[PDB]
């Protein structure tokens, strides 16, 4: 089978970090940012790694059981199924947002009630010792004065950690899945900034909260999800060092830029120059496979 | 080009259980026929033509479903409302702005915050709820109204239904489903909705995707929310855009672990399922949840479908 990308607008397409539209096309502010992002991740054959979904639907949900008058929740899988503990990092499709706390919304499931407000709100901490999904567990802030039972929700908004006091929200960051006594085994390996001219291009999308700098708290990811979601239905093999694409304008034509797609799923260009980069660019365009190209090909800057 | 209009139909090939509601973001936990087998649907969301034409209020993506933003002034309960990317909804020319929500015979509990963020402190998140059978309630006006008086900074917000309950009128009427909202109003019905989907006949009956979605309701049980399509399947006709070549395609429910088929299925091209449930109390209900669609071939309407589950 031969490899295609989806041929849908980018404006149009999905951050892999939380569901939500792409909102920006960008560049790390740092150039040696090396990312470490646990959803998003997903070999261009289709393997997912870390705690990625194939689809949108198990995206940035968190699911367990906790005892009224416990701190802990006890996860499972989004679907309910038992989380395999020292296995993985996290349940598939648990949020990745580092450097920052976590205001959740939760509901017992399913709902057993004819009246009543089921929403509740709980907040966590990701640095902290109780912090141990890849155990199998996370602890809220404050003791659970609510019944029993199989909750699900989602991150409502995030805010600045609570520790260190003062230290802003980075969610080029991932959380600490691991315990001070276990590493988290199997998580989605670190990429670094290819150099050689290449940058690697972040799709990001804004997410609720406060931060220091009073602005937006963007969120920055590999790969729109459609891709992910797109591999995964498609499993073509790799057949080059890269995927050569070009980023067209869907009502001329034009090429508006060329970029890489690597094996391992993620995307680099070649900025010309400072003030250059793929942030320039519309965000109505569609990128298209153009050919298997080895590593060594060189990018038209953009 | 030869190769577009050539190109060969195809659906995603993931497990059910995966795939995600085209109604709200979440993942897909069951099949069933509609409990009244006279059931006419015409929901707004999760509507696309297989060779991928968009209808309703239905989204190409996952990123753009079930969501609500609009402008509101302090003191105000009207939310004035615009695409969820900020842009103008040019009223009239549909519903209601792309992806927003198609929950009939419900009120809604929202939750909202004041886009961008320009705070350095503080909790950005504000309820509101919302009656949708009330003359405030006009989508296709360009607006909905609040039942409280909003008493925060006039801007621009961005939300979603976080629980839904039964409606406020008629008192005593429950959670349903299976209908949506009324989008226009008295003096003006809404323009360009969806078209209604109408059970086959024939020995044919419709099929649902399920996914469950918090609040209380009269019979003490699962809101469960039905959809036409999965979402993956409506971003993959987008996407491929492959010419319709027969009135309908044949579809097998193929379990992953046998190869085996476990149910044969009609997808028409106005983007819904049929199956042939097997005597009453039968349906595509009794199949486990891993199963993967396949497309065997395209076949006329008049193509008979073995009956699927056990009476
Ligand atoms: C636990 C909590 O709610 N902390 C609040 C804090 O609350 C109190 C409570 C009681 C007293 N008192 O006895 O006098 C004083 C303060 O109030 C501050 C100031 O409003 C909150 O911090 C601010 O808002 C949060 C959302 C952040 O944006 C923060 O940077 C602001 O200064 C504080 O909220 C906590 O802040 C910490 C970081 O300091 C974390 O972000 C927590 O998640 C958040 O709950
Ligand atoms: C305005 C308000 O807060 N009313 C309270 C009721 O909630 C409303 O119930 C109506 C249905 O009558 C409708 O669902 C609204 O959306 C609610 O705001 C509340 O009713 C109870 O809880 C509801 C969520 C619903 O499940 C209903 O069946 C149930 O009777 C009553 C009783 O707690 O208090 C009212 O003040
Ligand atoms: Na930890
Ligand atoms: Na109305």
């Not at 699911?63 to 499972?76: D, F, S, V």
């Not at 057993?112 to 407000?117: A, F, K």
Request: net charge negative.
């Amino acid at each position: 089978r031969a490899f295609t990308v989806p041929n849908i607008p980018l404006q149009t397409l999905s951050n892999s970090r939380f569901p939500s539209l792409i909102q920006g096309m960008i560049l790390s502010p740092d150039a040696s940012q090396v990312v470490q992002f646990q959803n998003g991740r997903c070999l261009i054959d289709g393997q997912l790694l870390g705690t990625t979904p194939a689809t949108s639907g198990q995206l940035f949900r968190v699911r367990g059981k906790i005892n009224q008058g416990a701190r802990t929740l006890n996860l499972t899988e989004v679907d309910g199924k038992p989380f395999m503990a020292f296995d993985s990092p996290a349940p598939v499709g648990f949020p990745d947002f580092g450097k920052c706390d976590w205001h959740m919304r939760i509901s017992k499931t399913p709902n057993n009630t004819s009246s009543g407000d089921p929403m509740r709100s709980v907040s966590v901490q990701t640095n902290v010792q109780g912090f141990v999904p890849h155990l199998g567990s996370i602890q809220f802030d404050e003791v659970f004065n609510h019944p029993t039972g199989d909750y699900i929700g989602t991150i409502e908004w995030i805010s600045q950690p609570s520790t260190p006091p003062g230290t802003d929200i980075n969610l080029w960051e991932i959380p600490d899945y691991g315990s001070s006594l276990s590493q988290a085994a199997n998580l989605a390996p670190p990429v670094f900034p290819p150099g050689f001219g290449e940058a690697l291009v972040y799709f990001v999308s804004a997410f609720p909260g406060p931060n220091n700098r009073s602005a937006p708290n963007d969120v920055p990811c590999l790969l729109p999800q459609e891709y992910i979601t797109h591999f995964v239905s498609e499993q073509a093999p790799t057949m080059g060092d890269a995927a050569l694409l070009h980023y067209v304008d869907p009502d001329t034509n034009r090429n508006l830029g060329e970029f890489k797609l690597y094996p391992g799923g993620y995307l680099t260009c070649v900025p010309n120059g400072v003030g250059a980069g793929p942030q320039q660019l519309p965000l109505n365009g569609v990128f298209l496979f153009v050919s298997w190209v080895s590593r060594f090909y060189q990018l038209k800057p953009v």
